[PDB]
Each structure stands twice: as C-alpha cells, then as structure tokens.
C-alpha cells in the first residue's frame, strides 16, 4: 500500500504559514524518486541525503509540513536562514536533513481583488524555535504604552494578510511548500522505499 | 500550438485597414487587461506597439489601435504602409506569460496567387540506399505564407516533416518546400502519401504511391 | 534610454554548454523582473525563463527545465542564462527583456524593451558533399534532382551544363535538425521531349569540391 502523499501535495486548500499543517505518514511504501517526478516542482532541495538513496532507508515516521508563502520567501525555508518567515512563522533547525519542495500556486491561491485568507505573522516578541507553531492572536505592543487587547498606536494585530493577486510579479505570487522530515525511533521502522 | 491563437497570415492593400485577432480564455484575455501586441521585422527584436489592450507607446503611429471582446483581442492597422509588413505577436501577462503564435502581415503589391505544388516519391536509387524522401515543392504563391500537412493514406503524419520558410522569388511571389522522411518499409506499406498545402484558407493536394 | 546588451552566443556541439549574458543600462535594474525568450528559425516567440527582481524566484519552461539556469547580479546590472546539455532543438535566437515591478504588481508596459538577440547554434555538422538523387518525371513534365545532406551552403545546380535555363527552379535549402542542408531543383519541360531528349543535373558544392553530374530519366 502506497503512502498517501497525494492528500498533502494535491490538497485543495493549504494552510496559512503561521498555522502550518503537519501530516504523519506511517505504515506504507514511499517512492521518493517517483515523488520527485510526480509533477514539475519549482524547488526540490534535499538536505543531507539524496532521494534515490532515501528509497533504501526506513523510518518510524515521516512528517509532511505544508503552507503557502511568497515565491521570494521559499529561500527562508532552509536551515540557518532568517527573515520574517523563518523568524516568526516556520523555522527549520540548523541540522535539518529532510527535504523542502515548493511550486507556484498562482492559479489556485490568487483571486481577483486579492486572496486575503492566507496570512503570516509580522510581529512577535521573540523568534520561533525549530518546528514551533504559534497561532496566538494577541495584540503586539510596539511602544511603552500597554495595549490591553485593543489595537491602536503602537498596538498591532500580529497577523498580516498576503492578499495574493493573479497579477503580482512572480517573486510575490503564492507558492505551496511541503517540508519532509524523517523520524527514526527505538520502535519498528515502517515507512520504506520498495 | 501556441497558448493564444492568431491567424497565420493577414493582408491588405496600401491605404486600407486590417485586423489581427488573438483568442485566449477567460483567465487571460477575457479576465484581465494585460494584453500587448509586438511587431517584429526580420532580423530584429520585437517592438511593443500596444499595451493594456488599447494604449500605444509614444512614437508608435496612431494608425495602430487595439481592442478586445470576450476572450478575443484585436490589433487593427489602418492606412496600411509598406513598412507595416512584419510579424505581429499578441501576448497576455496576467501573472503567466502567454504568447500568440504570430501573424504575418503582408501589404499587397500584387494580386494574391495560389501555389503550384509538385510532389515527388522516393527514387529507386534512394530506396536501395535504405532511405526514403518525399519532396513537396511549392511555388509562385502570394502572400508568402503557407501551411503544409502530410497524409499517410487518409491519416495525418506527425514526425519526419521538414518545411522551409517561404522565400521571395525573382517575380516577388514566394517558394517553399516540404520534405517527409520515412524508412523504405514505411513507404512501401501504405497505399499512398499526400502533400496538402493550404494558402489563404484554400488547400491544394498532391498524392504519390509506390509503383 | 533603456538598453539591454546581449552577448555570449555561438556554435556548440550537442551535449555542450554556453552562458548568455544581458547587461542593462538606463533604468533601475533591481526593480525589474527579467526574462529570456527565444525564437527558433522561422518559428514563434517561446518564453524560456524568469527571475524575480531580488533573484530569489526562478521559473523555467518545461522544454529547458533541468538544463538551464537563470541568474542575475544586480550590483553589475547583469542577467545571465547558463545553458547545459544543449540539444539541436535549442538552436534559436535568445532575447532578454524586462518587466518592471511596481508595488509588487506587473506593470502594463511589460516587455517594453528587448535585447538585440544572440544566435545559439547546437550542431555537429562538418563539411560534407551531398548525396544526389534523380527525381523522375511521370503537355509538360517536371523532373529534378534531390541534393541531400550537405554542409555548408551553398550548392549550385545547373542543367545540361547550363544550356537549359528556361523552366528551371532551384529551391532554397531546408536546414535539418542534424545541421545538414538539403535542396531540390526541378525543371519543367515538354512531355513530347522525354526519351528523345536527355536531361542532366550538374551539382557543384565548392565547400567540398564535390561535383556531380546525374541524368534524370523517366521510369
Ligand atoms: C497529484 O495529482 C496528479 C493528478 O492525478 C489525479 O489525481 C490522482 C491522485 C489520480 O486520481 C489521477 O488519476 C488523477 O488524474 C497525480 O498524477 C497521476 O499519477 C498517477 C499515479 O498515481 C498516474 O497514473 C496519472 O496518470 C497521473 N496523472 C498525471 C496528471 O500525471 C499525482 O501523482 C498526484 N501527486 C501525488 C503526490 O500523488
């Protein structure tokens, strides 16, 4: 029985990056070369170990994290980067050895007049830790004045809408992203290549 | 096949008008105003003539105008001048680049003329060399624009076609040729092959068979 | 005035590599998305690749994905295209052209300026004389000769050593995907003259001193 990669890669809608989804894959056969060749991807960068060689290992669990960011932000989805997306939305560890896959989704996630349903976190007191996920919605205090939960001067709502439009330049268009991470425990290793 | 569909050839006499169409879908020409038109003379880069459907850059003749209706854009050129003879490309870049296939505009200096077509089967010399070339020669046509389609028996032939661009003869009409390569056993097996030449929407066809 | 100045074309064998460059002047380069577009001889404009202003986003046509890399150097006002594993069908003129990005939107005046274009030829053709074949005639009749697989241009063709020139049409050559040329020459003659008159085509390929006399006869 084949691993259910399709319900992640071919999902009708994706999550806002601040509210990124994780899918656990287990108990199945996974062809990472035939997934390389599922379709045409704009980015498919595997850190550490090749895909053809991934087909010869086994793991306890593989995790598929997915979300939407701007094309120019995909370079932040890599170990050791910074910027608003790595700092406040989705963070990979320096020692990451999984894969990052991305493709242009202008046709699906942009709307005339702006798709305002995809958001990112713009303000945060501190940086995320690797694989942290912060769906908090508390008003951010930019100054000395307390905020008490009301927006105003120096008191900002922390999430910002991308407003994806079909006519944005390519660097600004929506990109769907999938991050593969590979977990091996002291337990049976049940996801393997054929 | 191009993403946007244009006619291969349009023409008019000096002083007259002509229109070039460009058909797309509701998610490009039909949905957005990122519709542009480019002029290209032989040997030079494309030049922007119309943008935002109907606007022209400074320095472009106001004889060039653009419009759209539904999913079809139109470039219109009034008061035709010799220097307008060129290829014209429409484009839509509403987030994804979609080009038309190009239209050759001829400014008529003589009456239109249908091509003569001569078709030759493989020579017995060539077949004994383990090759097989069909030769379709197209001459004396005007405007210089033709489309060539090859049939094996009754059915279209994809691969092995090599077709020249039209080239001006001394009399200012045009010539072209189309070459269909086959193996000797391809040639011997079908009952006939056909060379079909379309010029200004009228088709001339020639057929040869293994004797 | 806006200018895009291209360089780096040329002739390369299939499998080989070339690097195209496009140097911009007269506008703020880092505010422009840059594209490569190519045109194979006698064919339409084919979009190839795009790079965003920052350089962080790149996309490719399917025909070149995996083999071409677009890149830019904003501090040097430069756009590049690295072309590896080249194939016959990449033979074309390659143009760079800009798309200003304003407020994150594509401007209406996209591709308003283009480079002059550089020719890329992917071929391993070497000097080769043609194989000549007669094209037999079936109140006139057409006969000719097929002049195949030669390189480079030109060939000349005469009939009956130049004594015969009325009704002769030598057609411009086709260029094949292999890099080789082939042309035909036909002469139209009275049907009454077949057999009792004999017709010879004289093919000269001076780039390879191949001279061929061949007569064409009915079958
Ligand atoms: C993502 O979807 C494409 C499109 O396939 C559609 O959805 C599939 C789940 C299946 O129902 C297809 O028949 C649908 O057409 C998938 O590409 C297909 O892959 C199958 C093998 O599973 C192949 O037989 C089909 O011909 C493919 N069709 C195309 C368009 O290439 C693709 O595999 C899906 N991606 C993932 C990650 O599974």
Residue numbers in the entry:
A (entry chain Z): 334 to 527
B (entry chain L): 1 to 211
C (entry chain H): 1 to 138, 145 to 225
What do the authors report?
Different presentations of S-protein in the vaccines, particularly the mRNA-based vaccines, induce relatively high serum nAb responses in most individuals that appear to strongly target epitopes that overlap the angiotensin converting enzyme 2 (ACE2) receptor binding site (RBS) in the receptor binding domain (RBD). We immunized macaques with SARS-CoV-2 S-protein using a protocol that we have successfully used in HIV envelope protein immunization of NHPs and investigated nAb responses with a particular interest in the neutralization breadth of such responses against sarbecoviruses. Here, we immunized macaques with S-protein using a strong saponin-based adjuvant and generated potent and broad nAb responses. Unlike many human studies, serum nAb responses were equally potent, for example, against SARS-CoV-2 and SARS-CoV-1, showed potent neutralization of a range of sarbecoviruses, and effectively neutralized SARS-2 VOCs, including Omicron.
We isolated mAbs from two animals (K288 and K398) by sorting antigen-specific single B cells using SARS-CoV-2 and SARS-CoV-1 S-proteins as baits. To investigate the binding of the potent macaque IGHV3–73–encoded nAbs in greater detail, we determined crystal structures of K288.2 and K398.22 Ab Fabs with SARS-CoV-2 RBD at 2.3 and 1.95 Å resolution, respectively. The different binding mode for macaque antibodies allows for SARS-CoV-1 and SARS-CoV-2 cross-neutralization and retention of neutralization of VOCs. Although this particular epitope has not yet been targeted by human SARS-CoV-2 Abs with known structures as far as we are aware, the human SARS-CoV-2 nAb DH1047 (65) heavy chain binds in a similar location but in a completely different orientation so that the light chains are oppositely positioned. Likewise, another previously reported Ab that broadly neutralizes various sarbecoviruses including SARS-CoV-2, S2X259 (66), also targets a similar region but with a slightly different angle of approach to the RBD than DH1047. The epitope of another nAb S2A4 (66, 67) is slightly further down the RBD. We also tested neutralization by these cross-reactive mAbs against SARS-CoV-2 VOCs and key mutants. Consistent with the macaque serum mapping above, the mAbs were roughly equally effective against variants Alpha, Beta, Gamma, and Delta with some Abs moderately more and some moderately less potent than against the ancestral virus. For Omicron, most of the Abs were less potent (10- to more than100-fold), but about a third were approximately equally potent as against the ancestral virus.
